[PDB]
Write an enzyme that holds these catalytic residues in place. Sequence first.
Site, PDB file in Angstrom:
ATOM      1  N   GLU B 739     -31.665 -32.646   4.684  1.00 21.40           N
ATOM      2  CA  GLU B 739     -31.905 -31.315   5.237  1.00 21.40           C
ATOM      3  C   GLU B 739     -31.077 -30.236   4.552  1.00 21.40           C
ATOM      4  O   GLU B 739     -31.499 -29.077   4.491  1.00 21.40           O
ATOM      5  CB  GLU B 739     -31.624 -31.320   6.741  1.00 21.40           C
ATOM      6  CG  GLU B 739     -30.181 -31.634   7.111  1.00 21.40           C
ATOM      7  CD  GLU B 739     -29.928 -33.120   7.267  1.00 21.40           C
ATOM      8  OE1 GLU B 739     -30.841 -33.917   6.964  1.00 21.40           O
ATOM      9  OE2 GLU B 739     -28.814 -33.493   7.691  1.00 21.40           O
ATOM     10  N   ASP B 740     -29.905 -30.588   4.035  1.00 27.68           N
ATOM     11  CA  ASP B 740     -29.052 -29.628   3.350  1.00 27.68           C
ATOM     12  C   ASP B 740     -28.860 -29.919   1.872  1.00 27.68           C
ATOM     13  O   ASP B 740     -28.691 -28.980   1.093  1.00 27.68           O
ATOM     14  CB  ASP B 740     -27.672 -29.565   4.023  1.00 27.68           C
ATOM     15  CG  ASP B 740     -27.026 -30.929   4.156  1.00 27.68           C
ATOM     16  OD1 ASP B 740     -27.752 -31.909   4.423  1.00 27.68           O
ATOM     17  OD2 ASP B 740     -25.792 -31.022   3.990  1.00 27.68           O
TER      18      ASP B 740
END
Lengths: 131, 979, 115, 144
Positions: B739-740
């Site tokens: 996600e990051d």
Amino acid sequence: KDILCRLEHTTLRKVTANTAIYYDPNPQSTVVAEDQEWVNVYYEMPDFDVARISPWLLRVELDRKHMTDRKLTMEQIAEKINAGFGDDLNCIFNDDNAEKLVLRIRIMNSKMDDDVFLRCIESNMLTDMTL
Amino acid sequence: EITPDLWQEACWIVISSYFDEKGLVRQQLDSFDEFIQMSVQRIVEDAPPIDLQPPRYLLKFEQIYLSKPTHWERDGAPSPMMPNEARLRNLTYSAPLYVDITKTVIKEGEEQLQTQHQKTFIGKIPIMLRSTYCLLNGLTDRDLCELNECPLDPGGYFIINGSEKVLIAQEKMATNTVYVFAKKDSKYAYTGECRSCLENSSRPTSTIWVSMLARGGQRIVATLPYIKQEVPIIIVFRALGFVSDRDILEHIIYDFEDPEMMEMVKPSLDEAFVIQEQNVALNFIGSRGAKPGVTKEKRIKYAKEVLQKEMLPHVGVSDFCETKKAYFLGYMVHRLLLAALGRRELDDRDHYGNKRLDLAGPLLAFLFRGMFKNLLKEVRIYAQKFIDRGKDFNLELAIKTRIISDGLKYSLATGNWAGVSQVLNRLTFASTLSHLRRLNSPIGKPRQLHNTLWGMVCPAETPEGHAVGLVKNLALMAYISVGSQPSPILEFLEEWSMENLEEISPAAIADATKIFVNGCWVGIHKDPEQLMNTLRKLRRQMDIIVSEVSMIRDIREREIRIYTDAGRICRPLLIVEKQKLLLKKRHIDQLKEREYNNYSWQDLVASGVVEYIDTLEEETVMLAMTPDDLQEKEVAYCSTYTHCEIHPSMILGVCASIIPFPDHNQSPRNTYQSAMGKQAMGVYITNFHVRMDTLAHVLYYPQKPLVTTRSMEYLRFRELPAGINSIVAIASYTGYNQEDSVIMNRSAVDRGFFRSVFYRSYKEQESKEVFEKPTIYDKLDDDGLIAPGVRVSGDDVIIGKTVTLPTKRDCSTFLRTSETGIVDQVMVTLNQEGYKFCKIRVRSVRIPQIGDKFASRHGQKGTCGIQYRQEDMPFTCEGITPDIIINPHAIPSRMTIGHLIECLQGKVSANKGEIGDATPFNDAVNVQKISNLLSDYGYHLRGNEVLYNGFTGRKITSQIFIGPTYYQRLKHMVDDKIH
Amino acid sequence: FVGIRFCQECNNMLYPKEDKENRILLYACRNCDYQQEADNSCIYVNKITHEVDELTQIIADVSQDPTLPRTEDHPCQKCGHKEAVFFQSHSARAEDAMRLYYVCTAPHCGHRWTE
Amino acid sequence: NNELEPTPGNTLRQTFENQVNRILNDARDKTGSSAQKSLSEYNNFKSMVVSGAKGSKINISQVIAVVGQQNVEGKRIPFGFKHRTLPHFIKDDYGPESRGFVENSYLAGLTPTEFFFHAMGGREGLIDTAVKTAETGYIQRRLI
Ligand SMILES: [Zn+2]
């Protein structure tokens, strides 16, 4: 709704519409023109002492919608006043079905000011009767 | 005469003229110039002349004299001092200041002997960079790049002990203005407050309260300074000199035709009918206080003193000012009464108009006042000590410039007043600009963003955590008034009618419009419309009224307020006629050839085309968002357009202007990117080589964004940027794309992604400690300092320092837990005491590993997942392996469709050649046009592209969205934190 | 309803007072000897319903406000001016407060009404 | 024209604010539902929507259909100026354009007034999250 009205707190603020202290040179004179005939009807054969009434008068016109919503009547207010203060607060209630319903209060005689006394009585009465 | 469909270039060149005429830190420079020229000169205008005693001695100060910065060595030889020279050492870039003193002596011989000392050195005061009194003022680009100074450096900061300190404008409540509030728990239903002063003459706080008690009968009370107990308002009014109740009610209620106000103020009179004589009221007021008088006459005198000067100082402190003070008190009571009845809304604390911003000017003025008082007290002590014999007295030995110098140094270095004057953020140029343009709320509900902040303060830019909302940033067009003398407006007002408050019957006030100047009720006027028209004409012509003067007409309240004091914030914007702009095609043509034509933004202001509107005037003005389609004829919404914005995108700040298409994102993302841009890695200043600032990061290959905003043109971002444009594909490749995290090309990193140099500076001083090589120390030279260019590993000594032991103790400095690198520069110099000190600048090479954190202009901070070589990386039909692959699933989480639009516009710009424009509110550059442009260059219109798996060569079923996007390396790295 | 009465020679408030020998309401100043005959015969009235004419509070001067929403459909009946300016009551202590009052936009003629 | 008998238990202001908020909210929900149903089979957003519908539905609806009404303290944008949200409107303007309703989606771009109202809403959300995390941590520590 009938159950609700006897559970919701109701002071004199929620029922009253206007309040004013008048000075009456004579209760029969009745400077308020609309109340003259009813005053003449009431003070004849008085339950109280006419000579003991205060010259000042506290006339309060109630809110008809508020009275109808809470199923309140004049005699209930009068008996609440009598219980709260006693016999020396002679109060007279005009009528229920009469247009522009209103009621009057006087003081039975028994230092600082006569009118400010009624001011303070109304101030401590308007939010303490618990109708 | 009109500019239809050409409005974009016209407004943008107007903004260009504004920016290259004023700059970015114009507010700080103007405030410092006002403080130096006026506040320092006016520092002696109300303080009593020095008197001492029976021989008598009088001392007075005549005038100031400020010279260019100069440094005195140990021997005392003066020499010109330069900002780079001041920054290299740990000294203060301060200029000396001298004063002219006159001393008179009387020995009861009926003769006074007066002598004048001229240019008496009163002390060194710091000179803020790029100010009119700085040596860099009015210097060309070559002049700056021949004294080791960056031309792009905005200045507007002080050099205290070699550290660049910036003064942050403190947010405070506005002075001389009446506010009505309503507290819940407090026994007062409504409270009327008015903070009052005499333009920093003395007593920086002096406020009175006009409250009214809740009926849970409306008793109005007044709270006065130096009065412990509550005082009725009528008693104060009778003390002022109005015994009659009719006069008091005239001062309170201007229109006797209003009965409800009188019947609700009746309790105030009914509570003070006992006191009817003025002397009795003075005795009553003086009976309560910090030090009650021993006798009745002393109490009356104390009450007279506290009424005349202590309370409501702004309306007047003269001997005969009771009528004006009573009028202002009656105005306060009238405001409270009308707010109680619901005539006017309760004053809003969050309203930005009721707030002032203390720049370097007012803060330095307050500091100078305090230090001047301290120096005067020290001079009195010294004179009393040396005057017992009465032989003589010397001013040169009685002056302590060290007191002022140390006070200024301590107040600008440590920042204790807290939260003011911190070290300037020199990590990015955008970070430096944001730090130089920021605002601190007074609170240690300011959390939320008020409506009045539009144009005044950047909405998106704000920190995160406990400090969110507290720290704000100025918009691009925002400016702070430096304060002007209210007198010329006054003599102009008495030039017109303005029936004076001194000589008007109270009945005339009922139908007249009250006229205030800086909060003081100067008078009344009969025709307010034409008065405001004349005032506006004068302000536009700038003949008597400067452009920064704020003029407000509250028509319903029937009031006119004139504000000329420093602190209020305003922005310049267009003036509109009936339905047309004042800006014509001739102005645009003149501004187009700005050079060799001496037609700057000041000429545009003086031409009555653009004017400065503050928060106070914003309510009385109805703005136009854009002139292209608001003054045209359509379904009628509002035909009384009196003002127009130059460009809506100007509401953003320095950091918020970096975001391309910020209107396509949501506000949390814009705030997050404003936070990221401060720590974005890149070149920060042009002269980073000569200067030595600790924790410095320089990027190998900074690039202009392919997708840029016109505002960034004036931020000089393209002059020196922080970030690289990389081919980013939004795909989920091997699971290292969470996600990051993102996965970047190892081969392209070897080619130069975000390769950086980290300069770290170590400063050491010797004192009675000597720089000598002790008998690992192999790299140490004979001078105790390693020569630059040597590779230093962990547990290595770079500085050889030995302290004598009264066999010798070693006080050397290590490499702070294996901070590997190569020494870049070595410096030795003598300090103010003359002792030798050294500075070591060491550079370390930072190549992006799989722990370094990179962020786009849309998306949260994200570390590197894993680095794949070019063959491992997926490739398109043309062999374009994406530079960075990012998570598709992160759209709801970190990055928005603004990132996708940036990628599309970047692809379009790269194929076409012209750098794409990402103006926030453009209405001429949408997704469809960018898609059509991309399709015109042999690409999919939506930016998708067929990609081939790097490992297997198989054609990936889903076409990946790939395009060039601007990415920023961040200060947070594994290499910085392993040590 | 009661207004206000002021003493003349003392320029102070007059308070209600009663004389038994005449048995009538008067207004007398407590710090002096002045007395005045009272005609209203009502010392005060309490309006808890707070029924006040907002038109009286509205001033015609607000008609020349650029920020206000000028309207064309509703004309002033006093002078026939088609243009007007409508705004809400925006007054506290009034639960039923959204009524639109119109001020004529005539050249300083002025007229306040409600439709 | 205020014929419009108010609902019991609320004043005129609260009742009509509730009506306007309900209209705006149901319009926003209908537009979002239509936008979600628009994605038939190939849209990559639908893959996350149908599976990860925990909190992604509103974000997708904002991206495609409409950003929606911006609220502050559980109410529409307050009149920061004198009976006016922003100096670009008229006094006493209760229409959808003012008070913080964003007609345009994120793709179409937000108008400057809508941009400022969304900035206000995001600032309120940031404040709420900042206080909520601390309060939740304190509650967790106290309970454990
Ligand atoms: Zn009198």
